[model samples]
Target chain A: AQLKGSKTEENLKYAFAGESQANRRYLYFASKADVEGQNDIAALFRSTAEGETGHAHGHLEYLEAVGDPATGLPFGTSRQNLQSAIAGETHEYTDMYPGMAKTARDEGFEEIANWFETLAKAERSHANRYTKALDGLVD
Target chain B: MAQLKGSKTEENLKYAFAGESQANRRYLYFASKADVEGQNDIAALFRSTAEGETGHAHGHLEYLEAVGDPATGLPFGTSRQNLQSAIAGETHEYTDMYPGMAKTARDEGFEEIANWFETLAKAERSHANRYTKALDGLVD
Candidate 1:
């Protein structure tokens, strides 16, 4: 039901990188959601928690992005994780994505280019949002 | 269908924040990986969505005047050592993690979630097998 490391295999590795993070994201939330027993809320916790990682799989529709995957931003202190989160988006908005988006444009990948453009702005927003969150901790 | 479970508002709020935050971080990594591969646009795509994911994580954190950061670190080490951890992660997920989660979801009557877990459990096991094969190419 999937392709090996051929067309999107590598691109999909990032896909793997993307989804593995979400499984724990959902499970952790699902557990917490369940730990409380808000039957309705809990069900969604289990369901929507899928929101984070599940979509990363959609576009490709070929690779099993969820395969034996790797970890990211590992268990850090609350603040450190925030710092890590900020850095993640910062790198995207500032350096990586902008160029990647341009590359997409150069390659005539307008949709792909557009994809990056919207996301770059969003990355900036995320970085700022986390900074505000960090302030809460310091405050 | 496992619907919404409003476990202590503050508690679930914090959990959601952490997971969402992690998603942002996770996507960022994907962006970097794309950069490494010269998958420019794909990398950009990774960043943009990551941005959205991060915002969503925090949006939920706002509840309860609320919360602490979530945690988890990469297993670390070079490719060889990392693959070892990667192999272990799959072992943990398929063998321990997903199966248990599915059961819990089922117990909670989270039928959809339970089904998701069952399918992913199978997927993770396949992933583990692939990593093992790759590991052999590297080590053997």
Candidate 2:
């Protein structure tokens, strides 16, 4: 179905904002990790930041493809949507990643899964990171 | 007109390496200025990225120089003049506040460029702040 109307528009806007925020967060953390000499963690954060960048790009592409003007929304998402995005990432880390890792290993693609599994664990850690970062700001 | 082969390869490779190196230097120089301005967080970010880009540029240059593979052709037209000119052109604009340009150009629907420009502008603003702080410390 085509995404139109206020609700879908709002959802798309929310996704766009969340993706941008995630990109900034990953870049910030990656820079910090690199400064602290955590090369592996830094690389992971950088890669994750790239992934977030791709997501943001994809959302923008979709908006343009659908002939939507980006002028309507302010530059980011609402508080509720931001919370939902964070929650979704948490689920991916815990539920999705674990299942994917298992499948990859069984299919003799363990090495391929290795990087993903590590990132998954890091994503789980990010749940707490977000929580701590947003503790006082929200609610 | 036939495209010149051997000379172009060398020129292109040189331009590519030089462009990368210039990017690295720009980040570091900006980072240092940012630090002086008192925008520590922003300064740190630029500094970190500067380090990364420096390594990347150095790696590329080393590979090209060592391989010296004229087989795939020189890479760019002319010995190195065109490469230098291209690198100069890109750096000239980037150094002079790309973000401000992006913001002004936004009306023309340069959204992607504007977005990147905004980020750079933010960094530059942060760098100015850091410099101001450093001045304050020295004077007062």
Candidate 3:
């Protein structure tokens, strides 16, 4: 008894989760290989992890789980919302992502650490966007 | 200047990072709860807020720069090596990392999060035990 979109929806979710797990598990396995001085094996694992991530990305794209981006987001007066966004982005860029990145690097996950750093930079840009918007709104 | 591993500031950053990590997942859990309660909007809010916490924790970790070489190297050449690495990683998490984190949380007046770390530590111990048994039977 399988419905149409609903069954495929669940399938996408399941596939996404499976692929995501495989991606990370393989990455860790790769780390082990690297530590063992098995560079070739590590490369294989890393490539496999990359492929798994691509699969996960495809599944997620099909799922479209993000929905309408701003639909359920909390809203207030424009100034208040801009201020809130600015603060949140500032905290993320300055404090949170950096710490997580450092841990990832220390744990031998350099790729993941880079991902976090890139995200931190993006968050700073987001903060600047909000800050600029807020500044212009008052004048 | 980078804070030493045992410094109080480093300890606090770790504590906050852990808290943020927990909060990130906790919000998702809350989103699930909200969905079960038939509050779709609330679920959305929680899910969105969860991403915020995740980002904050990520940034906090960057500032801490806690990443360093592992105390023990992990190797994966043979089944024995795999098992060894597995057990070592699990044991480190259970006995050293999480317990120390739990104590830090408790010291910082974060009782519930401390309990969360304790629970994870126990689970990691269980994992280590299973891996240990598997390793024990492999060669000897």
DockQ computed for model 3 against the true two-chain complex using alpha carbons: 0.04
lDDT by residue (A17-95, candidate 2, tens digit) is 5444334333444554556565654565466455545545545544543432222322122222224334644765787
Candidate 2: Cα lDDT at B71 = 19
Q: Give the lDDT of residue A68 in candidate 2.
A: 24
Query: CA lDDT of B16 in candidate 1?
Result: 40
Query: Which fraction of the native contacts appears in each prediction?
Result: 0.01, 0.00, 0.00
Native contact fraction (fnat) of model 2 = 0.00
| Model 3 misplacement above 4 A | A1-89, A94-117, A121-139, B1-27, B41-83, B93-122, B133-140
The sequence of per-residue lDDT tens digits that candidate 3 reaches over residues B1-140 is 23435544445445455444434433454456456656565556557766766566555444443432122334333545655755676688688866876676566555654575577578667757865765676542
Tell me which of candidates 1 and 3 scores higher on DockQ. 3
Per-residue lDDT tens digits for candidate 3, residues A113-132, read 67668867877775675566
lDDT of 1: 0.51
lDDT of 3 at B75: 35
Residues B39-137, candidate 1: write the lDDT tens digits: 565456557766566555544432322222222223322334334554666677679766876676566555665576678778767756865765576
